[PDB]
Every structure is written in structure tokens, then in C-alpha cells.
């Protein structure tokens, strides 16, 4: 199937990717089939960005798991562009979600629990929570 | 282990291959495993030609180096079919990055400066820089 080429990651996993240009971005990685583009070259995944929806073949190497958190956030990114914060709150939402955590009850609100938790370490599932299926 | 055969090029080398009908054409040698399709003839090698990311066995003999590039680059295809220059942009690319070359910052104008890198020799590296790891 899809991506044996020996390298990190699979179908689902939640990543951070980095883009010359840009800060370390959450993204999902997904299927060629879903992109309607062509199969990802050899060492290469195909990982579609939380918050603009947009697909993008990116290199294993230049891919981490999401729940490295607190090293791949940019906390300068997140102040300064609402599309960041936009990209973090789906992001951790997905992350939430699986990982069946749960919390109380606007954006920078909502953010604010899920950016404590992210940040703390995943509790209590820790990374493994992250995991697709 | 697979490719010993005596014959040239291993995993991961970028290559030129000729398809009956068909100008060469850039590709990477991938390990049967990532095609999903039958082990290699001998004296074969699979390989994942850049743009399209489709897999085509082919004979070792009728492989040569990317490093070879003004010799191979067809101008005419390039200037005949978008498919050719995305193909270009995208071995020229994993080049780039192996060769821990960088371009200052459309295809066409990110394409001039990688061609005229590849052009005349792909220095400071030279050839050498193109190997995989
Ligand atoms: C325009 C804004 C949504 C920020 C750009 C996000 C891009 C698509 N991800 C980069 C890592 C390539
Ligand atoms: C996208 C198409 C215009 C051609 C891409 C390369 C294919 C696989 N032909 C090679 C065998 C030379």
C-alpha cells in the first residue's frame, strides 16, 4: 500500500510540517487519493494543513509528530497571525477528540484550555492519545 | 539484498530513463516495496518518475545519472509540455534540498534558477551532492 518506503508516519497522523518560508504548521497526513494530485515521490508524504484545507507533498524529514508540542509551537507565529491561532484550534480539536479528552465551555476562549493541555504534555493520555482510529 | 546484481544505481539515486517514445524523463530508484507491484527482474530496477509519481521497472542499462544534465534535459519537450517542466521543478527540487543548495524566492521563475544550477554542474557541491543520505 501507501507510504513503505521505511520512513515515519502514516495515514492520520497528525504532524507538524515546515515550509521554507514559514513556521512549523499542524497538518494531517493523508492519502494521495484525497488530494486529486498524484502519488507522493519515494520518502515524501502528502499532509493536508489544518486551518486553509490546502494539500502539500512534504518530505518525511521535514515532518514531526504533532505531540512534540511545546518544541514545533511558535508562540511568536501565534500572536502575531489569526490564521495560526485558527490552525491550532482545528488542530487540537482533531487531537482532542482523539485522545477523548474533554473540556468546559469565542476563539481565543476556546483555544485557551486546548493550548494548556497541548502544552502540558497531552494529559492524561500523553502522545499516544494522538494516535488515528 | 535487492539491485545486487552487478548492474549500476541503488536506492534513492535520481536518474534520467527512457521510455520507448518518450524524451528521458527524471526519476528516483525506489525498492520494490514502495511500488506495491512485483519484485524487480534481474538486471531491472524500479524507479518513480518525478511529476506523475507512477512506477515503471526498467532496465539498469538504460538508466544514467541525473547528474548528467545538459546532456539529457530535452529543451524542446520543455518547452512543448507543462507536465516536463513540473517534472523538472520537482527532481531539481529533491536535488536542491540533497544538495543543501538554496534559491532565493510562479514554476517557470522558480524553475530559471534551479536549470541554470543544474546546467553548469550543480556547483558548489557538483554531482556529488545529488547522492541520497
Ligand atoms: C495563508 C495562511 C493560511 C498561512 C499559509 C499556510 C500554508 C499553506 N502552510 C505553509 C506551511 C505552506
Ligand atoms: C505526465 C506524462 C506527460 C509523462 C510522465 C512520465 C511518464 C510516466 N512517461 C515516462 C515513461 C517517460
Redesign the interface.
Given at each position: 500500500?501507501?507510504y513503505?518506503?521505511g520512513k515515519e508516519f502514516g495515514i492520520g497522523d497528525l504532524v507538524w510540517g515546515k515550509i521554507k518560508?514559514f513556521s512549523w504548521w499542524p497538518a494531517m497526513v493523508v492519502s494521495?487519493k484525497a488530494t486529486s494530485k498524484?502519488?507522493?515521490?519515494?520518502?515524501m508524504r502528502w499532509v493536508q494543513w489544518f486551518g486553509d484545507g490546502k494539500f502539500s507533498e512534504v518530505?518525511a524529514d521535514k515532518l514531526v509528530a504533532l505531540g512534540l508540542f511545546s518544541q514545533h509551537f511558535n508562540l511568536a507565529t501565534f500572536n502575531k497571525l489569526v490564521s495560526y491561532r485558527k490552525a491550532m484550534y482545528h488542530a487540537l480539536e482533531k487531537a482532542r477528540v482523539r485522545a477523548g479528552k474533554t473540556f468546559p465551555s469565542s476563539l481565543e476562549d476556546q483555544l485557551k484550555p486546548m493550548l494548556e493541555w497541548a502544552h502540558g504534555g497531552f494529559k492524561p493520555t500523553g502522545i499516544e492519545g494522538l494516535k488515528p482510529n
Open positions: 500500500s501507501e513503505q518506503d518560508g494521495w498524484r502519488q507522493a515521490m519515494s520518502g518530505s
